[PDB]
Design a protein around this ligand. Sequence first.
Ligand SMILES: Cc1cc2nc3c(=O)[nH]c(=O)nc-3n(C[C@H](O)[C@H](O)[C@H](O)COP(=O)(O)OP(=O)(O)OC[C@H]3O[C@@H](n4cnc5c(N)ncnc54)[C@H](O)[C@@H]3O)c2cc1C
Ligand SMILES: Cc1cc2nc3c(=O)[nH]c(=O)nc-3n(C[C@H](O)[C@H](O)[C@H](O)COP(=O)(O)OP(=O)(O)OC[C@H]3O[C@@H](n4cnc5c(N)ncnc54)[C@H](O)[C@@H]3O)c2cc1C
Ligand SMILES: COc1cc(OC)nc(Oc2cccc(Oc3nc(OC)cc(OC)n3)c2C(=O)O)n1
Ligand SMILES: COc1cc(OC)nc(Oc2cccc(Oc3nc(OC)cc(OC)n3)c2C(=O)O)n1
Ligand SMILES: C/C(NCc1cnc(C)nc1N)=C(/S)CCOP(=O)([O-])OP(=O)([O-])O
Ligand SMILES: C/C(NCc1cnc(C)nc1N)=C(/S)CCOP(=O)([O-])OP(=O)([O-])O
Ligand SMILES: C/C(NCc1cnc(C)nc1N)=C(/S)CCOP(=O)([O-])OP(=O)([O-])O
Ligand SMILES: [Mg+2]
Ligand SMILES: [Mg+2]
Ligand SMILES: [Mg+2]
Lengths: 583, 583, 288
Amino acid sequence: TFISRFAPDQPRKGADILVEALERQGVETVFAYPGGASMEIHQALTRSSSIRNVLPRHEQGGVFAAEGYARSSGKPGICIATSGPGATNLVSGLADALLDSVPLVAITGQVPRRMIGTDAFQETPIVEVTRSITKHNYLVMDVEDIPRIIEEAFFLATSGRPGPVLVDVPKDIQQQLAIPNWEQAMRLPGYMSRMPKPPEDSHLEQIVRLISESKKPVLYVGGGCLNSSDELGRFVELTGIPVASTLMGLGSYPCDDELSLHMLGMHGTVYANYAVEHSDLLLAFGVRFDDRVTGKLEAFASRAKIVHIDIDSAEIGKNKTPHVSVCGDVKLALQGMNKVLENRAEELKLDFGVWRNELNVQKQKFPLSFKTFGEAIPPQYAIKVLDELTDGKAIISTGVGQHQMWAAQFYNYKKPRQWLSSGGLGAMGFGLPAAIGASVANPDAIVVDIDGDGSFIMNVQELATIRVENLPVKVLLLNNQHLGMVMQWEDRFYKANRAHTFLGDPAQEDEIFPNMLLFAAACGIPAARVTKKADLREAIQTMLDTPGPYLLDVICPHQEHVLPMIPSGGTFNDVITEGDGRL
Amino acid sequence: TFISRFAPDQPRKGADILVEALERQGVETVFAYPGGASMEIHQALTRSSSIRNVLPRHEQGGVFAAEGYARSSGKPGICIATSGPGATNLVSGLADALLDSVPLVAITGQVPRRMIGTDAFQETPIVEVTRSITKHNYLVMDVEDIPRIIEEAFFLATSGRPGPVLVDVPKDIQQQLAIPNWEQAMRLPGYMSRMPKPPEDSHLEQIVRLISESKKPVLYVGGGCLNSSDELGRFVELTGIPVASTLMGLGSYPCDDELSLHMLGMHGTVYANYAVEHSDLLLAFGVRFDDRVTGKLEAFASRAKIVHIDIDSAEIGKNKTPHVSVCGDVKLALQGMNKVLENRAEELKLDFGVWRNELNVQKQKFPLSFKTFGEAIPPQYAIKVLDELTDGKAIISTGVGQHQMWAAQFYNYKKPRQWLSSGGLGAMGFGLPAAIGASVANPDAIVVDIDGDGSFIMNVQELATIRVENLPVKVLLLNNQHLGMVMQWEDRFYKANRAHTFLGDPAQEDEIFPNMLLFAAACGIPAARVTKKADLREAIQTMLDTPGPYLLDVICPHQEHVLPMIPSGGTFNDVITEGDGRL
Amino acid sequence: KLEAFASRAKIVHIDIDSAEIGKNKTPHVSVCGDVKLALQGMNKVLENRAEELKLDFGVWRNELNVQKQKFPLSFKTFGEAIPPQYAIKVLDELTDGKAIISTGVGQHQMWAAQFYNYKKPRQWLSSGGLGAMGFGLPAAIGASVANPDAIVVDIDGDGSFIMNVQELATIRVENLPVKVLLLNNQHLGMVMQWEDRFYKANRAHTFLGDPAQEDEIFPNMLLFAAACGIPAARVTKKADLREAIQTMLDTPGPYLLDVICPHQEHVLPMIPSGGTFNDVITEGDGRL
Ligand SMILES: Cc1cc2nc3c(=O)[nH]c(=O)nc-3n(C[C@H](O)[C@H](O)[C@H](O)COP(=O)(O)OP(=O)(O)OC[C@H]3O[C@@H](n4cnc5c(N)ncnc54)[C@H](O)[C@@H]3O)c2cc1C
Ligand SMILES: Cc1cc2nc3c(=O)[nH]c(=O)nc-3n(C[C@H](O)[C@H](O)[C@H](O)COP(=O)(O)OP(=O)(O)OC[C@H]3O[C@@H](n4cnc5c(N)ncnc54)[C@H](O)[C@@H]3O)c2cc1C
Ligand SMILES: COc1cc(OC)nc(Oc2cccc(Oc3nc(OC)cc(OC)n3)c2C(=O)O)n1
Ligand SMILES: COc1cc(OC)nc(Oc2cccc(Oc3nc(OC)cc(OC)n3)c2C(=O)O)n1
Ligand SMILES: C/C(NCc1cnc(C)nc1N)=C(/S)CCOP(=O)([O-])OP(=O)([O-])O
Ligand SMILES: C/C(NCc1cnc(C)nc1N)=C(/S)CCOP(=O)([O-])OP(=O)([O-])O
Ligand SMILES: C/C(NCc1cnc(C)nc1N)=C(/S)CCOP(=O)([O-])OP(=O)([O-])O
Ligand SMILES: [Mg+2]
Ligand SMILES: [Mg+2]
Ligand SMILES: [Mg+2]
């Protein structure tokens, strides 16, 4: 039962109703940045003894923190901003949450209802702006609509295919006195009728049938399996089917396991892409068949009967037509198939050892490889050292670029929700704030931000947030003095013609710029720089063993390229396994 | 005549067509941040020997720099970003440029045409998103449409009421070979028919008539007069009418002049608001009657015949009904009235000395005042010192908050386009990037960023941009360790109840946090901190006399309040002249 | 009710629009493409592998043939009053089912779909999704222009026919051999049927005649045709119906046949909205 701070017959501000509405949703943490149009909400937040506010130094840092909080917990992330400039600073995070299907609730202040559409002070039609980059949004036009809208907002954000929901609240609504009705029915009759029912036995038994008739089965696991870790692992034990994962699905199946083909796709391993290329059965669970993965669709799993399980019917048959499809929760689908696979185990006698050995061969000839030059630190090596010293149990948030790929290639994630990274939108500056939210959601966990020098500096102001909130956030900065990912394409497709990809100072080219250590020192965060590979192990260890925040500036040669690589719209035969930025 | 780098019969990439299209528009400077969907454009930029690119460390810094470039020159500002996260980082700047009517052209990369609407890699419906926060936008669907669209984009952004125009360019269009047609007619038949004609003699002679019949005339000058500095000054000489200016219109009429009532509005001077309150003739030139200025409309200039001149017919009669209106260029309207006022000078014999003396009285009893506590630095005093040492000829960009108001109150701007500040949207983090763009547009000018500790840290990453580009940007940081503006409202309207407005470290409360000096040192920018008022003069002098970038951390007591203040929706009788955050 | 629709069947869905595959029901097998090509592909497989497959669904067909015997499409004849169902089946016989049929929307639309055996596609022109009244007569015009040598008949209701009655002028001026088989029940039959069954026969503006002269057919649709120089006639007795329809066909050019039917007729069978097969209604009308 819930205990309010107000009498059931006592009127109170709409702002207080809003906060209590969050308390009834089990909200424990918000990321709010105050402003004139949201002061009432912030005032009401101080009256709450159950909701903690983490004040960012930028609303983009605020919404990205809400993502990290969400991605690393399964809970919805909540960020609050003021009208106008505050709201527009949330845009990237909203679009990011929609593309990666992250459960998130964003609340923005707004000018009074009578002042809407008058080009008023700090007024932005944020609903009109964010309609195409949110799952749903609301504009509260009455104080009595607050309890219903909030309940709907959290329901829409967390149910079905998770996503961002924005609620815009006019300032006069926040100030209006009212008595809230908490037991009013939600008004989403359309959405709920479209909600997928539990998978039928007929569809599940058809999948198991295809499995027994296949000789080269491959699991195509994505971000939809983040809550099906136990069920998926159980499924693999019963089938012995190798697992290829997406960027979003890392950790769903343990990467240190023998049956893990790791990641497939543009920068996926050679054997993962090989497995799908020559498969005769493709089990696509919780994926959306992105062109970063498939490449040229007509060649992607061309000889395989495709099984697609998704909770969004709009994704089933969009890019490729599946021979068997199940519209519903993959968690339930696995549970249903597991019981069938166990009671009929002796009858089926599944054994894909021949196929697994064929894949194990490819795993031997073409493994993930990097090269060591003298005492220069390989970015790949640094990440694998972090894996060993954290035993692969750390929560890893990243920016976007070369460092992002290496963080996905050279770290074996034991469990899901250790891997926090912008996949669909691929937004830089995501790493540091996401680490903040993850650390708040998981206080006792090892949280490390594997960032690039370009991505890190974008939201560097959040270092202040980290110190003030006393969060044990570790920052493993892979510094190549460049926008590496763009630089790589320049080397390979544009004859190494540099077009504004150098981030250092041309006046003093052999000096590391900027001095990221002084950024940390500005926020009272202990930091250090490592250049020699021999000094790397103790440096990373020091970062971990040192209590609280820490920044490790790892200097790497910028000539490194992410391998392997399948060019855009390319096939498996177009894979690139050699080459870098050196001559 | 223009000289291309390509033969008239030679095919070339759409990206090269785009860049040449900018060259033909006289573009000398762009603010572009590279990405996968805009690499072709950046490659084409390197082939240009006339277009300089200033690489920011964040696209928001990129678009804000384009604003400062535009606001301080009259030229359109050009910023370029990649698809998805790059585009969404421009949103705040686009909305900012629309509300303050700033001429700006934003170019964003986009996924291939065939991949649009497929939730593709880094895809954002930026046209759908920014339709309500831009003047116009485009989605290029053919390479041959590039020259026409670019010409229309610059035309729409600079003509009539200036504003932001976004052009979204799919990557496949950038790569497609074609031969551009530069002499094709623009397709804006509707917009051009609505373009205001030069003001008729009948309307102008009606205004002059009202002037001769008035005894208490007041000039209501705004951002629409930024190009009418000479004409306005000439108009004042012929009439002797006192000048009240908006936040956006500062500098249009010299503030050190005797007839200058400085700024009116919520935080406008007592005598400026008094003048409008008791006027019998209100000459509203280049204003939009914002509620920050008028307050309660029904009481704003209640006894005055109102003359409104605007280039946008949608603004004339929106909030208040004028007795006389002229839809057109205020520059031409002034030119027309000046010739009439001079040839009919001896016949009119205008003399508002009695009214001016009445205002001069109010100017004596209620002047702009601040208080000095011991050796603590008054933020107001620091700004007035900057005025004296720069002789009021410096370009001033600000963030948003208390420091923004004091920068507008205690600096006498001799000319327009010295004052760069977010007025309509009021976006924090605007100051530093705007200073960058202004410094690039005006290399020989003194550029100073009067920033707040909250606003400064939001886009602190642009300090790297300043050093790399070697820009003589001065940063006068008024540090109150708080979000002052919100804090002020807390003190006055919420019983000083702090709701996340403190920006320092609660663990070490008497220590200035963060150490902004180390932020500058990280980017190799010389910096210093001043605490005692006696040391302030030489400190500011040192900042100016030191070549190149410089950061001065000015520590001020946070108990200071911006005065005077008319509460929202209030009248002149509700003005607050006393009080601070002290007890 | 979707959950009960083909509940025990493995579903194969072939559509050229991927947005339709898996929208309402999840198919066990789906093909996104031209059904014409899908049939062509399956036909070649079914023929070369014919002796291997040996398909035979005679038992299932006999089970269905049984249901076809016990519950066939049925109507009732009252004295010499013309059954709308009978009139349409007569049109079928006299046109040998080769005529192009356009309809309005309502009871007459359903009977035109139930009691006419269409040999080929594109003989049946009717608003299905939107179900727009007044569609029949203009659609007949366009069909007659596209198919000059074809027998074009508009099976219309008195409500649907009058909505776009002005197109009778178009028919005469363009000299189109459009036949108009008007099933006149003096009501908005479809709405009237729901009134009888779900609202205790409470008439809510469904009568189209003149209350002042209730036993007179209103309006006189024959005069509508005469206004546009179109030969027309009215038939009331069932015995006179056969020669009347024959006259309509044998008469060159446009023709309007005003067929008067009792308004108490109901369209059968009927499964209520959101209902299942067990909820099917096989009996009942507007009579007491
Ligand atoms: C520089 C860069 C390079 C990249 N290269 C690669 C690469 O090489 N390989 C790669 O894989 N990615 C890569 N990406 C990321 C890529 O763009 C996408 O993020 C990813 O490919 C798509 O993830 P997904 O297929 O798992 O689907 P997701 O984006 O994770 O969406 C989840 C899907 O599962 C469904 N779903 C969700 N919940 C459930 C449930 N409970 N039950 C059933 N279904 C559910 C959803 O409806 C949705 O369709 C890269 C990104 C960047 C920035
Ligand atoms: C914290 C804060 C406090 C603020 N308080 C105040 C305050 O106290 N006082 C104040 O004044 N502002 C204040 N503002 C700013 C305020 O919100 C607006 O920016 C300002 O009041 C409106 O400017 P404006 O009236 O000059 O019109 P603008 O926004 O400058 O628009 C220009 C107008 O002139 C027209 N125009 C443009 N060009 C021409 C031309 N060539 N010929 C004719 N017409 C043209 C345009 O159509 C437009 O209508 C504050 C902002 C902030 C962030
Ligand atoms: C904390 O400092 C400031 C400063 C300021 O103006 C400079 N405004 C606000 O809050 C708003 C934010 C957005 C729009 C606003 O306009 C507004 N809001 C109202 O809500 C009660 C009423 C009102 O009547 C005119 N105008 C307001 C407003 O409070 O004036 N806060
Ligand atoms: C499949 O065919 C194509 C063709 C094309 O243009 C020729 N673009 C895309 O997708 C993108 C969408 C957005 C940015 C893109 O550039 C890009 N993509 C990367 O994918 C990880 C990385 C990267 O590093 C610079 N650039 C790309 C890109 O594939 O080039 N796909
Ligand atoms: C510019 C760019 N992409 C374009 C871009 C621009 N802006 C944003 C917000 N996001 C993206 N993805 C990348 S991945 C390079 C970033 O380089 P990095 O952060 O230093 O990492 P690394 O050099 O290891 O690739
Ligand atoms: C939070 C806020 N306004 C809400 C807000 C939030 N986010 C943005 C981008 N813009 C605004 N205007 C202000 S003015 C306080 C800023 O304080 P400051 O930058 O340190 O300046 P000062 O303390 O002198 O008022
Ligand atoms: C009112 C109605 N439906 C509502 C309606 C209203 N308006 C239009 C344009 N279309 C429709 N479908 C029907 S089906 C009754 C029409 O009666 P009818 O044209 O005389 O045919 P019948 O009486 O045999 O059902
Ligand atoms: Mg880098
Ligand atoms: Mg401050
Ligand atoms: Mg009828």
